[PDB]
Amino acid sequence: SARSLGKGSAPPGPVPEGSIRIYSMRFCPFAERTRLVLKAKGIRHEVININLKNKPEWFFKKNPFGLVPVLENSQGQLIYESAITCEYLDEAYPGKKLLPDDPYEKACQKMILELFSKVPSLVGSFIRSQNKEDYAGLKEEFRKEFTKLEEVLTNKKTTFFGGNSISMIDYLIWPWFERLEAMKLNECVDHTPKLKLWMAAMKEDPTVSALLTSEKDWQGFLELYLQNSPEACDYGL
Amino acid sequence: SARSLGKGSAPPGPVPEGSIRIYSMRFCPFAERTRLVLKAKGIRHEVININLKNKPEWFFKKNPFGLVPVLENSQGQLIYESAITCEYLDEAYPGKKLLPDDPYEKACQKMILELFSKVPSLVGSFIRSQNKEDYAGLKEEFRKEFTKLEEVLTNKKTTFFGGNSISMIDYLIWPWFERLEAMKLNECVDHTPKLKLWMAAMKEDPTVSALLTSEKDWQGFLELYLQNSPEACDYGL
Numbered sequence A, B: 001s002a003r004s005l006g007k008g009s010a011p012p013g014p015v016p017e018g019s020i021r022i023y024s025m026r027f028c029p030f031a032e033r034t035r036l037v038l039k040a041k042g043i044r045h046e047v048i049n050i051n052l053k054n055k056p057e058w059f060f061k062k063n064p065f066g067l068v069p070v071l072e073n074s075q076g077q078l079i080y081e082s083a084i085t086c087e088y089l090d091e092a093y094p095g096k097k098l099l100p101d102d103p104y105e106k107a108c109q110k111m112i113l114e115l116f117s118k119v120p121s122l123v124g125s126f127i128r129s130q131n132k133e134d135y136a137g138l139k140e141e142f143r144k145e146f147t148k149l150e151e152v153l154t155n156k157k158t159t160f161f162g163g164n165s166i167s168m169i170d171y172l173i174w175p176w177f178e179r180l181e182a183m184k185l186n187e188c189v190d191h192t193p194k195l196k197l198w199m200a201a202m203k204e205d206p207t208v209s210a211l212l213t214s215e216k217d218w219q220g221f222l223e224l225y226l227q228n229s230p231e232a233c234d235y236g237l
Ligand SMILES: *CC(=O)N(C)Cc1cnn(-c2ccccc2)c1
Pocket: A025, A027, A028, A029, A030, A031, A052, A068, A123, A124, A127, A179, A182, A183, A218, A221, A222
């Protein structure tokens, strides 16, 4: 069931009532945002993994851009863009709100999200390594963006980006910091002490911990991704 | 009072109670989003224009990135990023909501906002013209992005991007289409009929009409902007 669907696969059936479907990929950091929210809010759902190297024809009817995550509810309504799927889930399901209701506090979370906006592209580029001379410069980009996040935590004087308790903004940023060890980028935070403390606090969170991927599984994916293998998305069953 | 403040100007005083302040620029399309929301919701406010060619030192304390629009309330709280200032105003002030309360409908508006995300950078690049051979290709980029917006209106079968009545998403996209005539880009919509009808419907909206800038004022700004003049932001008093 967890095996990714690719080109030639049958379009899935309708989403049953009382459940929501996520079109994801087990190693995708953008899809992980949504999976963190689904877990934190205890939402009943089904997972359909997509082979991003060999996409099913029908997935373009889910998202014309062909990117995961994509949410589909029992009414056939489709929601995509990882931050949008997270806010939609926060609003459409009961329980504690991950995004604060206060207009100013909610705006601050989205202001930090904008501040982080360069990091996913920097990670994407770093994975597809070109030469040794580029690495030291691409790591200089990481230090610059991570100091922006350090200044936020310094000015807030709190453990998390939305206060002294975990909230939406922390789950939105976490997937890229989770992969820092597997990418051998642990030195890019050696000058951001509050950010380093935030990473360890995140690893202790029950939701984050339950969705943690082993160092070996990250490596297995990365190796097959650099080989452009259509088995990359299915590493480690 | 409407004259823009620049380097060497005195930091402004506190925002009085019952009012909100916008740090803007009369010809900035990003700041225009916020000004459209302030008008549509009938919000009492004050406008401080910033000389973007000769920024005041204190403006970096309002937005570390030094970009307009920036909101400041009586509590000294600062809000920036044009879409964030618009949603904050919609949530923190009474009256009709510009963003629908329905989680799915609100998500769709933000999905269209993401779809439009390439157009502001394409406009920014087009203003700073390099050569005649680039123009036809940069206009091919516009047709490609405008067809994405055409497909939305076609699939929705409504006059606006959020239904048969104007809503937030329309004010968020409008400033770039308003400037299409002054930029001589009217041929980039000659293959998007619903988008052309949306533009004329927008021009009839009371809020849009009250914030319309004359063709002569757009030209006066553009000429001085291409000359890198610090008088550009203050064209036409
Ligand atoms: C959904 C998506 O954009 N991808 C699957 C690309 C991607 C970006 N970052 N990763 C990543 C990085 C390090 C380790 C595992 C996965 C994948």
